[PDB]
Write a protein that binds this ligand. Structure first.
Ligand code: CLA
Ligand code: CLA
Ligand SMILES: CC(=O)O[C@H]1CC(C)(C)C(=C=C/C(C)=C/C=C/C(C)=C/C=C/C=C(C)/C=C/C=C(\C)C(=O)C[C@@]23O[C@]2(C)C[C@@H](O)CC3(C)C)[C@](C)(O)C1
Lengths: 213, 173, 174, 191, 174, 208, 188, 150, 211, 169
């Protein structure tokens, strides 16, 4: 009976490429690396300013694009779960060596599998120190989202200047996009991979050791 | 590339997976310094495994409680566990200074600067007839390449018996 | 500018003229009170502790008046206050201090609000003949000696009476 | 347009058979490309299955050695029993003895997940090069180790046209033959 | 390219009844010539290695610490390989692998516009630079290797099926 | 560098300039190449001069040559009663070794401080005379090189040829005195000195 | 213009490299505070005081943990300096109370010098004129290196003094023997 | 007093140059070098008298035998010397204090002291040796055993 | 390359220039063909003139020795045992190192070029030519020359020595297999004569104490 | 628009025919609900078509698990309750697919150009090119979908009343 928000969300003349019966979301342009138009719930078309979680909207007038926030959140979910699925399997001995720290706190006779390493080290205190170290990094890197939301920064999403071996230093814009797609494609799978390991070990059937089935 | 030192006669330049173009010229300059440091470490590691594995040890005492003889009775990878922790702190502390010094040169080797040269004693190998230095840099890397295979065979033979057919009934393994 | 005692602080401008001037007023008491009132309070506090240090360290060194009253006997410098309020010796000195301070209440009020031209701490008491026509740079050299020995005795008495009731020992702490 | 597609030849007189042309004559060109790809792909599996059956109906298991007592085609017994699975303990000598249909049940399930992953990698490469990158040749999955497809070029040459018809027809022969050979393993019907 | 390459002789000019030279590209034929020559050089070493191990001549004196050379000279050469120690066959399979790894990674591969595999160690290759003399010499390597390919298949068809050749299968070594 | 080739050609006309390690083209303390090439010349001359005196000093102190008179306040003669001259250095005293080492250490000091240094305008090996340089307050009668004056009057070409046969007699005595001390710690080290050398078997490279 | 320490971020506007340890490291933008008696002058004086307090705390712990307490303080004998405070307070509490009131007179004067030095312009933050040897009188490039060396050693000593507090209050051992038991625990 | 006036004494023969391996004369002004020279000669002239006072009573147990009145008497008498030393440097010298205009060796208190610039070089050098010597007689004599080995 | 084929015109015109391995057009160590063609000339000149030196060392060392001392320990010869290739072991080892010291120094002087008097054979000099000792004789002491120590030749015409160079390596390569008809005649011998010799050390080259 | 043809006479109503069959009159009362009705008819028709196959095929073949065997579950009519751990996984994955069509249901009017029931799903290319027989391909999906809507009620109650084999007793 008023004008529907459906028309503000969809393109209405183009279909989504991944889901061909749905109209294309308005923010998905194909310019982002892993973009195949997959947004069947239209979460990029949500008109909220999701940078309000970091700095509230009543602090000052600002607004981040919803697709910029989702890609910054997707890239952080990609890069965390790549290290996390690797670190679960490396400390479980999936790659041959049961890789542990030199301390006896982290030894296999104290922590037999990586399934028990969370609760055993919240109690000891190694996870409380990681929460400080990650929280210090997330405070210095998370404040750039306010600089983007105020329009003062031209920084791309998930685009710190962290290229110490400089793989993308002289590369063209086309092969930079291919490398960003390989980060996204391997990150999307490692997110689902970490969903596999953390759930199959948590069943009542068990198998806290590799291969977790 | 082939104008670089490490390309030699049988396979030169050797890059079937084309890893040199996977980054920039600063990525290849990192790869060359990492191959050279892996070679220099494994050349001392292969020689350190064969000298200590032969029974050749220094005379006397390593610490006030640990002798050099008591370490030479063990296999070499097990002899590191019985080095005193004050001794490992002296080794790693000196390596820490050597890695901080060779990184803090005025030009980085990733930006075309020099590769890690000798810290102590700080011998200058600058004007050492670059035609000879070219041939000796090919022989440093080739002896580094072989000793990286050699020390990985030494860890594999000490843990998985029969993995190296020349070190099956070798008593040091 | 740039107070001498505190070189990281600006100079308080109301101290200019007075003789103990080291530029030391970080709390800016001179911006609230008149400096004739503050100087009169400093010399009076200092003249008391000059007498109070010499009156503390002589009594507990054994010096007594002669002939000593029998109610004065068996007292150190700590115990001599509470024992002689009962005897009335403290009320005799408080009487004659209140007589002098009632006249000096008139002279302080006349100094601040009636413009008598009286220097703070001046009472005309110089019977032994100092400042014999001396230069005012030589008189101010003597006024600095009264205040510096006065300021020293205020911290000197404060130690000799705190360390006295902390230990109740012999002279170099009591 | 199904009667002017590629795989028709003189065995039916350059005429698509009528029960098969009745399915694809009122259909899109993507319907022809789907069924042509699935005919070649079924012919590829059936081509390596007739040889995998002949390896299984004989005893030419690993290790291969043309000398006597080496499990070759003439003398199918060996002396080494190369131990396909170490945790299970089964060798290639055991699987060569049982049956054609029982040979599959002796392969461990962890060995099938190495096969189905590699066959799963290959089928998504085969999908990308044929359908996503829209190839005009059915069955062209970009796999050519010895470089036949760089012939003239390209695909519009008689050598690569006749090789495409040779592949479909030998895949057509092998599709009946592995259906005729494993039928008699189940029920004797060699009519 | 099949006209411009050795292998063409006088009994059969360019023997290709199935036209497999022009079936693929230049690279496919260059793979075929590199596979005929590699099958030639294996089978020439195979025909020689069967005859001098069936003639009984052998090295002195012990192959391993447990296995003598004379123990393998008594049995047939196809059965002598089963009695070579597993550490010795691993030494053979490593140098064969290291030669195959080098010849396929020496620059400008034979499937491109490059040379066929040469001697890995020591690298000299003994080749005549005269193209009228060299072309006959590599035309001699091929058909000697072609005959040795048929010969070693006759040696394994006489050691597996008794019979199959008239001038063999009466000898206790073939 | 240009002079170093001209020196080594007169030492050997077959082997003109021999440098496998190419040590002659390096610096040490960042001076320049021409200043450290005087350091290398001075260190070679000092190594050969010490080893020349060590070789004559070996064969004197290996045989029985204990000369009167013993200079001590109680007795304790020169300890040739072992004999075996690497053992003989140990049996001096502990406090007698600092008197020998610090006296050489003045001559090491005076060759550095006085008239002209080898890492400059050179002439390495030239010991400065004690009569000049005004640093020593005694003064002393004799000099280290020419105490009796033998032999001033020799021309420059007579003395330029002297260092070239000092370098070659110095290079051989470096090999000479080490061939003795190698057989003091490992037999069969030198082949022609078997049985002569009595195997000191301690540590020759440590004073105390 | 981008910050040096965080090159993905823009440079904070009030940080222009004029101070000593300035590499533009202010991701939260705390130098833009100008409200509750707090600005860049107050935060710089707070950093410089936190630098100098923590610098004296590290060498103050390491003096007693190596050489022992001063003469007159021999009843401490504890390598945990958090524990050795309570034995001097148990024995001679007057000197710690004399030091606390002398700090109180210094700090209340320092709080006036900070606020009067801020409304004026005649005092740099952390400047007290304590250069009795006279390092600032010459070699202005060498004096700026001394200004940077104070900030660099004080920022390092802030983590060290905070660590010696926290790992002294939780292990009750002492900093140097916490270091020795960390070496033998995590050795490989 | 400038930096070249401070470094012109003593002579530098026994090392060869001015011996500053850490470059500490390059950090600061001429005022902080005059503080280094005045504290070198004060450290030296105390360490000379401290060396003979070892052998005049020959260790640290004699200081433990000094009473509480004894330690406080000599420490404040030396404090009375060093108080009026910096006072008479400022008030009774033609140039001023040693950090302002005076000599860094002048040590102005009348009565403590009782070809001369040559004796200044023999004062710093003879006190440089005793600084090493009393550091020997505190470390080699007391704290570990086998230091010197003398 | 062409001058090597000119020698084969003078060596054997019945057979002729003959390289089955075709090593005259190869290169060794990447140093080119013209250095390879002179390494090959020097090596078979060295192989032949050692074999001719051993062919007369096999016909008189069987039949006639000098008997005097042979050592400072008694037993005053290896006590022939007329087979010459078995007399080498008991010589003893202290004498073998002195032989291996002079030949190490003599072949040092050959590749040196006489201190630089002669050029090198890969870079120009005639391959059979040993550099004279005239620069050692000028400095240390009078040593005799290796080839002709007395000065008998240098009386020849120039055209006679290339006639004698081609006679030298032709006599050289026959004595290469000529001396290899003797030590190969002692281990499963194989010849028509029968009888010359028997022994079995068979090669290579030192014995009981080493390695 | 498509399925309103015949001739198909209505059983147990001999006068009426299937031509424009709407006796209640939903096309006249609520014409704006008509693309919702076709989307609901096709979804009912497609699910009932797979249910008719899914009620006959597990009477002969079983999936190789041993909790699906004839000894565990003899009749197909008991498979919904005897296998709750697999019905949740069918429900859970249908729930993801059906929620992905909620923005397609939110535009079923004239919002965007998607025809009702058309999910762009034709991998095998069987949809013909000419529109004159695209409609009879759509008509066949409706007639076979409507028939399986009727028949799955006949299969279930035909096996509930008389528990027997396929045709029924
Ligand atoms: C004794 C040292 C030595 C070593 C370690 C090798 C090693 C090798 N040679 Mg051999 N070779 C040698 C001496 C040696 N050779 C000698 C003295 C000759 C006669 C000149 C040859 C003639 C020869 C030929 C003709 C060939 C080899 C080849 C090879 C390679 C594989 C053959 C094999 O498996 O064995 C291998 C790297 C093969 C090669 O390089 O091609 C792939 C090959 O074809 N060699
Ligand atoms: C954060 C600094 C700090 C604190 C809180 C302490 C505290 C303590 N020390 Mg430690 N110490 C320190 C630094 C510190 N020290 C330093 C830098 C050294 C030299 C390396 C030492 C060397 C040391 C020794 C050898 C000993 C102690 C001992 C003690 C304990 C008793 C001493 C005492 O209370 O003195 C009373 C306080 C005073 C006499 C005056 C305090 C300083 C005044 C306020 C001036 C401050 C000026 C400031 C530094 C700069 C100017 C500021 C302004 C003008 C800008 C006490 C817990 C003793 C102990 O018992 O160990 C268990 C002991 O033997 N300290
Ligand atoms: C078969 C037959 O009939 O013979 C019979 C009879 C007979 C005659 C008795 C026999 C014999 C004895 C023989 C043949 C003995 C062996 C002879 C031989 C041929 C021995 C090579 C030594 C090479 C050396 C020492 C290399 C040094 C090389 C060095 C140190 C270097 O490369 C480095 C260097 O140069 C450079 C590269 C670069 C410079 O910056 C640095 C220097 C200068 C340091 C036999 C075999 O027993 C049996």
């Amino acid at each position: 009976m008023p004008e529907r928000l459906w028309d503000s969300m969809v393109d209405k003349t183009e279909r989504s490429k991944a889901v061909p019966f749905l109209p294309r979301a308005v923010n998905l342009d194909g310019s982002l690396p892993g973009d195949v138009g997959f947004d069947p719930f239209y979460l990029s078309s949500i008109p909220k300013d999701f940078s309000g979680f970091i700095q509230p909207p009543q602090w000052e007038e600002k607004g981040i694009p919803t697709l910029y926030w989702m890609r910054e959140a997707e890239l952080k979910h990609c890069r965390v779960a790549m290290l996390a699925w690797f670190g679960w399997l490396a400390t479980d001995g999936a790659f041959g060596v049961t890789l542990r720290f030199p301390g006896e706190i982290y030894s296999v006779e104290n922590i037999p599998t990586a399934y028990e390493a969370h609760n055993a080290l919240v109690s000891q205190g190694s996870m409380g120190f990681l929460l400080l170290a990650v929280g210090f990094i997330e405070f210095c890197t998370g404040a750039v989202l306010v600089e983007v939301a105020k329009g003062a920064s031209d920084r791309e999403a998930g685009d710190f200047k962290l290229d110490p071996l400089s793989f993308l230093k002289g590369k063209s814009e086309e092969e930079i996009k291919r490398m960003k797609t390989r980060e996204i494609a391997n990150g999307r799978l490692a997110m689902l991979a970490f969903g596999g390991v953390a759930t199959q070990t948590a069943l009542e059937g068990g198998n806290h050791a590799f291969p977790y089935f | 590339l082939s104008s670089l030192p490490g390309s030699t006669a049988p396979v030169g330049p050797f890059d079937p997976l084309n890893l040199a173009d996977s980054g920039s010229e600063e990525t290849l300059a990192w790869f060359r310094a990492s191959e050279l440091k892996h070679g220099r470490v494994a050349m001392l590691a292969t020689t350190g495994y064969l000298v200590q594995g032969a029974g050749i040890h220094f005379p006397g005492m390593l610490s006030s409680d640990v002798s050099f003889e008591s370490l030479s009775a063990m296999k070499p990878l097990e002899a590191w566990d019985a080095v005193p922790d004050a001794g490992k702190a002296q080794i790693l502390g000196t390596i820490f200074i050597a890695e901080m010094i060779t990184e803090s040169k005025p030009v980085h080797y990733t930006k075309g600067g020099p590769m890690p040269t000798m810290v102590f004693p700080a011998i200058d190998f600058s004007g050492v007839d670059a035609a000879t230095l070219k041939r000796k840099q090919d022989s440093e890397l080739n002896n580094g390449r072989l000793a990286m295979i050699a020390i990985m065979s030494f860890i594999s033979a000490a843990n998985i018996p029969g993995s190296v057919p020349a070190l099956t009934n070798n008593p040091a393994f | 500018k740039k107070s001498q005692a505190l070189p990281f602080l600006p100079y308080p401008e109301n101290l200019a003229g007075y003789v103990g001037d080291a530029g030391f007023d970080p709390f800016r008491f001179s911006d609230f009170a008149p400096m004739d009132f503050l100087r009169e309070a400093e010399i009076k506090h200092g003249r008391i502790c000059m007498l109070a240090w010499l009156g503390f360290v002589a009594v507990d060194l054994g010096a007594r008046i002669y002939p000593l009253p029998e109610a004065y006997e068996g007292l150190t410098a700590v115990t001599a206050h509470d024992a002689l309020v009962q005897q009335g010796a403290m009320s005799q000195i408080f009487l004659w201090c209140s007589v002098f301070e009632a006249i000096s209440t008139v002279s302080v009020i006349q100094m601040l609000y009636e413009e008598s031209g009286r220097e703070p701490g001046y009472f005309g008491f110089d019977p032994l003949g100092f400042l014999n026509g001396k230069s005012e740079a030589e008189v101010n050299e003597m006024k600095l000696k009264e205040i510096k020995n006065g300021r020293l005795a205020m911290l000197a008495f404060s130690g000799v009476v705190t360390q006295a009731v902390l230990t109740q020992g012999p002279f170099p702490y009591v | 347009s199904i009667n002017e597609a590629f795989g028709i030849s003189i065995e039916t007189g350059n005429k698509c058979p009528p029960l098969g042309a009745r399915i694809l004559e009122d259909a899109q060109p993507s319907a022809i490309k789907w069924f042509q790809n699935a005919e070649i792909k079924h012919g590829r599996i059936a081509m390596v299955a007739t040889i995998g059956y002949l390896v299984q109906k004989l005893g030419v298991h690993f290790p291969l050695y043309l000398g006597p007592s080496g499990s070759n085609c003439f003398h199918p017994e060996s002396e080494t029993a190369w131990l396909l699975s170490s945790s299970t303990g089964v060798t290639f000598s055991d699987i060569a003895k049982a049956a054609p249909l029982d040979a599959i049940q002796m392969v461990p399930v962890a060995g099938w997940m190495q096969i189905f992953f590699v066959a799963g990698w290959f089928e998504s490469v085969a999908y990308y090069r044929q359908w996503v990158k829209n190839s005009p040749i059915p069955g062209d999955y970009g796999y050519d180790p010895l470089g036949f497809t760089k012939r003239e070029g390209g695909w519009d040459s008689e050598e690569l046209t006749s090789l495409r018809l040779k592949e479909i027809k030998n895949g057509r022969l092998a599709m009946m033959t592995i259906a005729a050979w494993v039928s008699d393993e189940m029920i004797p019907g060699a009519l | 390219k099949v006209d411009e390459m050795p292998g063409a002789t006088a009994p059969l000019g360019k023997f290709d009844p199935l036209n497999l030279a022009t079936l693929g590209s230049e690279s496919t034929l260059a793979w075929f010539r590199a596979a005929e020559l590699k099958h030639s050089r294996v089978a020439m070493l195979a025909t020689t290695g069967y005859l001098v191990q069936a003639a009984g001549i052998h090295f002195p004196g012990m192959l391993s610490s447990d296995v003598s050379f004379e123990s393998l000279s008594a049995m047939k050469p196809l059965d002598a390989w089963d009695a070579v120690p597993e550490g010795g066959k691993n030494q053979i399979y490593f140098t064969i692998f290291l030669a195959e790894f080098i010849t396929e990674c020496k620059g400008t591969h034979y499937t491109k516009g490059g040379p066929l595999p040469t001697i890995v160690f020591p690298p000299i290759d003994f080749s005549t630079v005269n193209p009228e003399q060299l072309k006959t010499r590599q035309n001699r390597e091929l058909n000697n290797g072609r005959l040795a390919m048929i010969a070693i298949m006759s040696f394994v068809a006489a050691a597996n099926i008794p019979g199959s050749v008239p001038a063999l299968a009466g000898n206790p070594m073939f | 560098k240009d002079d170093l080739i001209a020196i080594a050609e007169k030492s050997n006309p077959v082997l003109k300039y021999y440098d496998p390690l190419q040590l002659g083209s390096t610096t040490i303390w960042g001076e320049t190449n021409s200043a450290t090439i005087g350091f290398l010349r001075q260190s070679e001359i000092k190594h050969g001069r010490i080893a020349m005196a060590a070789f004559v000093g070996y064969i004197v102190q290996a045989n029985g040559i204990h000369f009167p008179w013993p200079m001590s306040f109680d007795g304790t003669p020169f300890p040739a009663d072992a004999g075996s001259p690497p053992e003989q250095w140990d049996a001096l005293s502990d406090a007698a070794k600092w008197q020998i080492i610090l006296f050489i250490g003045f001559l090491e000091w005076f060759s550095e401080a006085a008239g002209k240094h080898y890492m400059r305008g050179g002439k390495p090996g030239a010991f400065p005379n004690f009569s000049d340089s005004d640093l020593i307050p005694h003064p002393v009668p004799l000099n280290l090189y020419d105490p009796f004056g033998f032999s001033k009057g020799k021309t420059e070409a007579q003395k330029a040829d002297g260092l070239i046969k000092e370098l070659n007699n110095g290079r051989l005595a470096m090999i000479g005195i080490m061939g003795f001390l190698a057989e003091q710690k490992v037999e069969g080290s030198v082949p022609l000195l078997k049985g002569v050398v009595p195997h000191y078997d301690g540590e020759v490279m440590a004073p105390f | 213009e981008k910050s040096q320490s965080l090159p993905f971020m823009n440079r904070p506007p009030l940080l222009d490299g004029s101070m000593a340890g300035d590499v533009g490291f202010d991701p939260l933008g705390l130098s833009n505070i100008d409200d509750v008696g707090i600005d860049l002058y107050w935060l710089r004086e707070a950093e410089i005081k936190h630098c100098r307090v923590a610098m004296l705390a590290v060498v103050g712990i390491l003096q007693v943990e190596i050489f022992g307490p001063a003469p007159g303080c021999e009843m401490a004998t504890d390598k945990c300096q958090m524990d050795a405070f309570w034995q001097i307070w148990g024995a001679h509490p007057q000197y710690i109370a004399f030091g606390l009131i002398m700090i109180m007179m210094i700090e209340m004067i320092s709080g006036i010098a900070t606020t009067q030095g801020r409304e004026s312009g005649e005092r740099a933050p952390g400047d007290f004129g304590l250069d009795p040897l006279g390092y600032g009188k010459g070699d202005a490039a060498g004096y700026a290196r001394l200004q940077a060396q104070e900030i660099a050693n004080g920022r390092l000593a802030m983590f060290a003094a905070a660590g010696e507090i926290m790992q002294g209050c939780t292990t009750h051992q002492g900093a140097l023997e916490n270091l020795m038991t960390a070496l033998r625990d995590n050795s490989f | 007093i400038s930096k070249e006036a401070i470094l012109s004494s003593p002579d530098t023969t026994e090392i060869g140059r001015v011996w500053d391996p850490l470059g500490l004369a390059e950090i600061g002004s001429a005022e902080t070098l005059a503080w280094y020279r005045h504290s070198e000669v004060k450290h030296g002239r105390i360490a000379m008298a401290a060396f003979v006072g070892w052998w005049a009573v020959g260790g640290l147990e004699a200081w433990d035998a000094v009473p509480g009145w004894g330690k406080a008497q000599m420490l404040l008498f030396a404090g009375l010397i060093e108080f009026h030393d910096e006072l008479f440097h400022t008030r009774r010298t033609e140039g001023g204090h040693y950090l302002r205009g005076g000599t860094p060796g002048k040590n102005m208190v009348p009565g403590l002291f009782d070809e001369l610039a040559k004796g200044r070089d023999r004062e710093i050098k003879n006190g440089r040796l005793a600084m090493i010597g009393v550091a020997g007689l505190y470390c080699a004599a007391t704290i570990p055993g086998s230091v010197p080995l003398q | 390359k062409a001058e090597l084929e000119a020698i084969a015109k003078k060596a054997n015109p019945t057979l002729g220039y003959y390289d089955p391995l075709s090593l005259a057009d190869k290169d060794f160590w990447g140093k080119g063909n013209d250095a390879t063609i002179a390494f090959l000339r020097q090596s078979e000149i060295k192989h032949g003139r050692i074999a001719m030196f051993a062919f007369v060392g096999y016909i008189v060392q069987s039949n006639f020795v000098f008997p005097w001392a042979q050592t400072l320990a008694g037993a005053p010869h290896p006590s022939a045992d007329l087979s010459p290739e078995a007399q080498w072991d008991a010589i003893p080892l202290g004498a073998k190192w002195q032989i291996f010291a002079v030949i190490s120094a003599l072949e040092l002087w050959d590749e040196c070029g006489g201190g630089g008097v002669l050029p090198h054979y890969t870079k120009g000099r005639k391959p059979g030519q040993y550099p004279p000792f005239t620069l050692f004789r000028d400095n240390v002491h009078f040593v005799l020359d290796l080839y002709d120590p007395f000065g008998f030749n240098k009386n020849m015409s120039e055209e006679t020595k290339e006639r004698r160079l081609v006679s030298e390596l032709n006599n050289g390569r026959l004595a290469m297999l000529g001396i290899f008809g003797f030590l190969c005649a002692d281990t499963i011998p194989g010849s028509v004569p029968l009888l010359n010799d028997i022994a079995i050390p068979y090669s290579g080259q030192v014995m009981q104490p080493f390695e | 628009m498509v399925g309103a043809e015949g001739p198909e006479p209505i059983p147990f109503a001999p006068s009426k025919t299937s031509k424009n069959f709407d006796p209640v009159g939903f096309a006249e009362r609520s014409p704006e609900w008509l693309p919702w009705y076709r989307e609901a008819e096709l979804k009912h028709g497609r699910a009932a078509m797979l249910a008719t196959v899914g009620f006959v095929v597990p009477e002969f073949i079983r999936v190789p698990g041993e909790q699906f065997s004839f000894e565990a579950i003899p009749k197909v009519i008991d498979a919904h309750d005897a296998l709750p751990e697999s019905m949740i996984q069918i429900f859970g994955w249908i729930s993801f697919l059906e929620a992905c069509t909620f923005p397609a249901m939110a535009g079923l009017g004239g919002k965007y150009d998607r025809k009702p029931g058309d999910f762009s799903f034709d991998p095998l290319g069987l949809y013909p090119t000419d529109p004159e027989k695209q409609k009879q391909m759509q008509l066949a999906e409706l007639k076979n979908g409507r028939l399986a809507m009727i028949a799955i009620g006949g299969m279930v109650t035909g096996a509930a009343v008389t528990g027997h084999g396929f045709p029924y007793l």
